């Protein structure tokens, strides 16, 4: 019943076994003769064993700038920072003389060091296909008074699967077990692809391309590291007139990267979980599933219409009705026939609607036929007769 | 004397007018028979009347995010932020129903607004060629004790020129006037170019290219909070019809730098430029005069206050102090062979004179190749120094 209200909803009926396709933002409603109707949804996808290949700096900051110069013939200057791997240093020559604090005139050595601090980075992660955990929520069409579209899932059984551990039995309280034998059909195969994770965005790119990016990086081994390799790629030393040396940053490469990542497979991201484009093709066996209460009698009393009939985006209708008679637990009689009550016409979605408690109303979803129809719920006397229109 | 110590120094000599070329980090020393030796340096170039064409945002920030949704058939939602020109808003549709707070099932309108704040921008400035003011410093070789290489210029007469007001007379206190008739020799002409100014960097780019940049901008008139084309850096994502999200497209600073590779880079400094273009001047010294050419020679002895040093161009600078009496008076100076037979080196600081006994004088001279004798003053106590 969770699928009710989502536009990207599929209605799959098995001719015992049934192949369904789950993806994010898509729900699948499965039906089978004398089997409970079930709602499946892919709630979350997670890569749990991702090996950081390389981390690139896309926005950096230079701080703790220190300079030392020497007068001509006084040797090469030196700073301790030149041995600190978090500092980038460069030696040059400046014009020195009387007017510049030297007793004699010549090229005095200069040295400028600055602390390379990354403000924004990009991480490349290698993910093994079999380590992609999926979380599917199975919500049975139990008619429960609040079961309709309830995201909380206090109604559906959550189950986690992986491309290897493809087969799982999930028990549904009151309906038995359902066997699921799933299989991943991602857009691209994770072999030679790198999951380029930046911020809240993510992409799938060629390994060699990733490694060939001209940006400062930290190897997967040194994570939380401070010895950024190739700092030169974002740092530039300028001494054009031999008067003074200046250290200048090359500016955030974030948008540049985004432009470069246009012809790449984008992945949505969320703090180590992924909303992935690909789909999951499962096979579902209902041989162990059973209609709860297949041995129950028909409700005798009359029913009241607690909530106005509503139409879903796929033409089906949902009717929430409350039992006022006596007998509960009892089977709800339901039928959609023509205006002349000659033959049953529409289909039932919420197969086998049953009452559990008189106070708790029941939600029944059915596919009415095109045009004028009659929704008959209950039995005479007080048998509810509602006329419905279907353009 | 300012040129002394700069490697990019030129020694220009003119028969009895003289054409010189000034650029940043280049000094020119001019000499002429019976005329004072002068040091010229281009100290600053400034574009003074630049009309901001457009200002682009290269790094932005979205804050104060606000959302409103409505149930199906309940109309279009609305926020006041939609009327605030600092906010970027967008309407979409989400799946609504019983499980989502609506009495019936359908597409409910949503609207998301966020405050667009620029964190880093780029300004395009149009500069008129004739408005490029140059600041040249003319420092005479006056020998004063500290004049040597003094960047302050408290001894050098500053002069500002423009490609139009090319001809200027500059008066030098004690030496008369010098006529300068300059001309610009830039690399590119400012016609159809825009000076793309970002931070400490600057470039010269095609006008149409500049206007074709897909970034949020503010017109020259609004220099303001109503950033135009905010869409170019903001994106609204609603892929599953459940929720709308507003996401920034990330700083374009480095992207711009990459795009600006095949462009003429200019260095910048808070509205001043370190332009690569050379200024070709002509200098007339007919009104220039050696200060004190009628004074007599010093009789007393001189003292050597500072160790002789050699410049990058082989010239030497000698600081000497007068101990005798007669000041103001002319220092006798000569650089001859070891046998004192004939004068060999040249004088750079022509007509070195003493003003006050306490204040030493800086004399710059070109010694000859090899062994030489630097003779300063006259016997008795005439300084005799040896050069290699």
């Amino acid at each position: 019943m969770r699928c009710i209200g989502i536009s990207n909803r599929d209605f799959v009926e098995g001719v015992s076994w049934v192949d369904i396709v789950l993806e994010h933002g898509s729900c699948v409603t499965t039906m089978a003769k004398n089997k409970p109707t079930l709602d499946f949804e892919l709630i979350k996808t997670e890569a749990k064993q991702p090996a950081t290949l390389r981390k690139y700096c896309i926005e950096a900051k230079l701080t703790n700038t220190t300079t030392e110069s020497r007068c001509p013939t006084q040797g090469e200057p030196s700073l301790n920072e030149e041995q600190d791997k978090r500092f980038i240093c460069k030696h040059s020559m400046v014009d020195r003389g009387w007017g510049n604090g030297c007793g004699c005139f010549g090229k005095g050595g200069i040295v400028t060091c600055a602390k390379f601090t990354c403000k924004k980075n990009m991480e490349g992660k290698i993910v093994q296909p079999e380590n992609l955990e999926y979380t599917i929520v199975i919500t049975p069409h139990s008619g429960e008074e609040h079961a309709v579209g309830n995201d909380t899932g206090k109604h559906g059984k959550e189950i986690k699967i992986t491309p290897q551990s493809s087969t799982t039995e999930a028990e549904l309280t009151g309906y038995g077990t359902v066997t699921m034998e799933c299989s991943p059909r991602t857009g691209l195969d994770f072999n030679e692809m790198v999951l380029l994770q930046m911020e809240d965005k993510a992409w799938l790119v060629h390994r060699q391309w990733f490694l060939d990016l001209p940006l400062p990086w930290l190897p997967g081994a040194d994570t939380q590291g401070s010895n950024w390799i190739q700092k030169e790629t974002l740092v530039t030393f300028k001494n054009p007139h031999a008067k003074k040396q200046d250290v200048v940053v090359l500016g955030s490469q974030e948008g540049a990267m985004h432009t470069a990542l246009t012809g790449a497979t984008e992945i949505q991201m969320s703090s180590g979980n992924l909303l992935f484009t690909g789909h999951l093709k499962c096979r579902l066996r209902m041989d162990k599933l059973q209609l709860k209460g297949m041995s129950y009698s028909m409700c005798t009393g009359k029913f009241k219409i607690v909530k106005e009939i509503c139409e879903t985006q796929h033409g089906t209708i949902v009717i929430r009705v409350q039992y006022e008679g006596d007998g509960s637990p009892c089977k709800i009689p339901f039928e959609i026939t023509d205006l002349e009550k000659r033959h049953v016409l529409g289909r039932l979605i919420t197969v086998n609607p049953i009452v559990t408690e008189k106070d708790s109303p029941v939600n029944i979803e059915a596919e009415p036929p095109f045009g004028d129809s009659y929704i008959i719920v209950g039995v005479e006397p007080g048998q509810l007769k509602l006329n419905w229109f279907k353009k | 004397m300012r040129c002394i110590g700069i490697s990019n120094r030129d020694f220009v000599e003119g028969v009895s007018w003289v054409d010189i070329v000034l650029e940043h980090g280049s000094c020119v020393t001019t000499m002429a028979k019976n005329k004072p030796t002068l040091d010229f340096e281009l100290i600053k170039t400034e574009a003074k009347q630049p009309a901001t064409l457009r200002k682009y945002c290269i790094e932005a920030k979205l804050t104060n995010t606000t959302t409103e949704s409505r149930c199906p058939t309940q109309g279009e939602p609305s926020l006041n932020e939609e009327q605030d020109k600092r906010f970027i808003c967008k309407h979409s549709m989400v799946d609504r129903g019983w499980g989502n707070g609506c009495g019936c099932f359908g597409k409910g309108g949503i609207v998301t607004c966020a405050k667009f704040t620029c964190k880093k921008n780029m300004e395009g400035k149009i500069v008129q060629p004739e408005n490029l003011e140059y600041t040249i410093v003319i420092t005479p070789h006056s020998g004063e004790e500290h004049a040597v290489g003094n960047d302050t210029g408290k001894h050098g007469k500053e002069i500002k020129i423009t490609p139009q007001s090319s001809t200027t007379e500059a008066e030098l206190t004690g030496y008369g006037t010098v006529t300068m008739e300059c001309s610009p020799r830039t690399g590119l002409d400012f016609n159809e170019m825009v000076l793309l100014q970002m931070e400490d960097k600057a470039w010269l780019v095609h006008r149409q290219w500049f206007l074709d940049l897909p970034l949020p901008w503010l017109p020259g008139a609004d220099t303001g909070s109503n950033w135009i084309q905010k869409e170019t850096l903001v994106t609204f994502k609603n892929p599953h019809a459940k929720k709308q999200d507003v996401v920034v497209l990330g700083s374009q600073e480095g992207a711009m730098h990459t795009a600006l590779t095949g462009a003429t880079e200019i260095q910048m400094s808070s509205g001043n430029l370190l332009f690569t273009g050379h200024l070709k001047c002509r200098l007339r010294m007919d009104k220039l005069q050696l200060k004190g050419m009628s004074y007599s020679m010093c009789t007393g002895k001189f003292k050597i206050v500072k160790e002789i040093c050699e410049t990058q161009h082989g010239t030497i600078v000698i600081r000497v102090q007068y101990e005798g009496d007669g000041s103001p008076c002319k220092i006798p100076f000569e650089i001859t062979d070891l046998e004192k037979r004939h004068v060999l080196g040249r004088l750079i600081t022509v007509n070195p004179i003493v003003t006050e006994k306490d204040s030493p004088v800086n004399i710059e001279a070109e010694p000859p190749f090899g062994d030489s004798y630097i003779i300063v003053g006259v016997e008795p106590g005439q300084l005799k120094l040896n050069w290699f």
Partner: antibody, heavy 133, light 111 residues
Framework: EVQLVESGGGLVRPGGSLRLSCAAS????????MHWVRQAPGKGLVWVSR????????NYADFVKGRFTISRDNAENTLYLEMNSLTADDTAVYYC??????????????????????????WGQGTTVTVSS | QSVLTQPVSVSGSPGQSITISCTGT?????????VSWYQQRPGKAPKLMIY???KRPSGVSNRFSASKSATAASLTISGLQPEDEADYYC??????????FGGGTKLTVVG
Amino acid sequence: EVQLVESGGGLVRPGGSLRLSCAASGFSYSNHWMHWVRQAPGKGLVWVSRINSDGSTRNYADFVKGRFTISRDNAENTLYLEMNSLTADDTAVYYCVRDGVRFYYDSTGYYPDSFFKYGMDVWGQGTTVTVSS
Amino acid sequence: QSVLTQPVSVSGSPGQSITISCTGTSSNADTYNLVSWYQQRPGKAPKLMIYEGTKRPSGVSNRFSASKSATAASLTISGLQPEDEADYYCCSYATSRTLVFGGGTKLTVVG
């Protein structure tokens, strides 16, 4: 003559920030090194920081682990000291000081030669900073 | 590193010549070659008295002179007058980039 006038001193809460600003006039400011010195009430002088002409060289005392940033605006003839994470140890008078002698050796005031001859010859009246609660 | 220490107090009589020492730890001849001396009268701003170990700026009374050694630097005041009853501080480099002051010496002129 030549004088330096400090501003920005006052009451600040512990952990708070303050910006001191010194206005210089009457001498070629852009070519001089500038220092900040402090003095706790009734106690001795404590050197805090220095900045060269360009601002490319900015040095700080060991007690300011990174909490103060010195800066300058040559065309405005202004010196600044940005202070964060202030504690009771920092209550003091802060003096703006010129290194006039180095000017006599390096008229550019740029080059950060090791152990260069210096002299703090011009001092401001000082601004009182009181970090209290 | 380098730490400069001075005597806490020095007491002199008018007309007398007193000497205030500035000694350093982890210091060398260059520390003292660069020593400067500052006079601070009560409630007044410091005044530069000596720079480069021994040079006296113009305006500073010729009664003030200074000396330096390889282990200490000293300021000498000849002919003590009531007008010089200040705190005196020495200063030099702590490192190639950073300066340090001494703890100060209070000089009393016995009136």
